[PDB]
Amino acid sequence: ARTVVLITGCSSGIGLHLAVRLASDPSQSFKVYATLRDLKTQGRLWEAARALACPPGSLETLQLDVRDSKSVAAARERVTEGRVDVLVCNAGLGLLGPLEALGEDAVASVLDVNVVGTVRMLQAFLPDMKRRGSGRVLVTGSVGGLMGLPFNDVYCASKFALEGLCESLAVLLLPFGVHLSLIECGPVHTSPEEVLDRTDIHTFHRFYQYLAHSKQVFREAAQNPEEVAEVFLTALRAPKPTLRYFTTERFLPLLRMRLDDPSGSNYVTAMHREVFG
Amino acid sequence: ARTVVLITGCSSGIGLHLAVRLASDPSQSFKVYATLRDLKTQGRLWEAARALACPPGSLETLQLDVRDSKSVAAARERVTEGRVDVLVCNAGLGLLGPLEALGEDAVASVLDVNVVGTVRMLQAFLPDMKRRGSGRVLVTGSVGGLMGLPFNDVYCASKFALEGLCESLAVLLLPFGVHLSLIECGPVHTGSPEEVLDRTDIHTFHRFYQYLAHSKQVFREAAQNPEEVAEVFLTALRAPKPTLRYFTTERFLPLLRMRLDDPSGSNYVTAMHREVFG
Ligand SMILES: COc1cc2c(cc1O)CC[C@@H]1[C@@H]2CC[C@]2(C)[C@@H](O)[C@@H](Cc3cccc(C(N)=O)c3)C[C@@H]12
């Protein structure tokens, strides 16, 4: 039969592009369930699917809010085939700021969505994969999950968390026939009085230095979602897929140098200089 | 003046033994605020302090629940000296089982306590350290935050989270003179099988008790004491130029190097599976 794929966060960005890219495969091997936090936002997804003339029956949309395990469960049941062959945990939020400037609500939401939401997906869907003896799981990773970056403290915390969660599972799942892969993405194309009042003069200084230098890095390094989507394909098609795929080699140098020094301090020293000019 | 230390998770283990070790230090240079989630658990802390002769005013206990930022705020207000010279973020939960067997609340708890709790600590205490231009933060870390282990998926997520949190901060804090360190602990010596089986398949049930048996042999061979771990905290406190990571044992550095050698993660997964399961 068709390979059944379920992808979260499908309304914009990487999810959309992967969803339509699989639905329009001319072998037409893929039945795609594209899931969205709000089904009302699906319009843009359907336009891109028409533009590739996705055969009807190749792409179905569901509501799936990863904060809520009832919405996760309900979505699992809407998979009328009664299996998922490829699960793509892509739903994620950002958070940028001096740590002490972030509300408690915001910090928790990032963790609730990027980490706990991924745990909910895996809890719902891994058992049937394990029963069948096969399955693929692809998780939207970050270079931020491999190296820490100033003012992304909670974001990197959630992406590092995904590394640990997915690496922990992969060790168990290898002989269950289930293959877990992280797609490590770099950047992807898609008042100040407050900051000062909630921080201090030096932190405030370093944050606008950061926002300025960061924008230069996206301009050079940012990838289009369609390019990243291809990396998911490669992983998906790989016969013996590996734990990580990098969408770019741009940060292998800083990554190798981070791994040279266990104490951590060369990474901190270098990253500081490189970020703060 | 003495060095003001505030430590979370002092009812037992690393927090209790480090707290009494510093308050009883022969220097007499430490004033320790040993904090606890529930004050009723302070029994073993006081008996230990009594046993090591902590002098008057070397040790005070505060109720502090890392889940509750008003608790954290109230604790900060009880620091009479108006500053903390060493903050130790040691409060933490374990969680051990097949991922599908763990309850959603327990999962949410580990994260709230190990990761958001630490964030709340750093929110409440880093600013004053930043504007002073001085401070040391020590965070209890794990080798489980550096490499993933089967059936420790959520615990590892949480420890990995701390690595990212702390490393992101360290890049910022370098010119402030506020030093952040992770004390990377290996095993330290301090779900009902029923519930587990219901929620997991048969092969995973077996694999888990296979993991538990190997685990108990690793703990027997290689576990450290809280007393031994507490020395590494103290070495890090005193270091003139502290590093981001202190390892309590050298034992896992080989595996860690292998993990880092192969960025694709393939080698680690094979090796760790064999290591754990044969
Ligand atoms: C050393 O090179 C640098 C890399 C970087 C910066 C600055 C540098 O000097 C700032 C952006 C950051 C990159 C490295 C790669 C990073 C970590 C990417 O994976 C990006 C992760 C990211 C993407 C979108 C939102 C967020 C967020 N809200 O925090 C975070 C942000 C990127």
Ligand SMILES: COc1cc2c(cc1O)CC[C@@H]1[C@@H]2CC[C@]2(C)[C@@H](O)[C@@H](Cc3cccc(C(N)=O)c3)C[C@@H]12
């Ligand atoms: C590399 O060889 C091994 C190391 C290990 C094991 C099995 C191995 O084959 C199983 C236990 C584990 C050690 C490596 C270091 C580990 C991960 C330590 O950090 C321990 C962490 C730990 C302690 C207490 C509870 C929990 C938890 N999941 O709640 C986790 C548990 C240790």
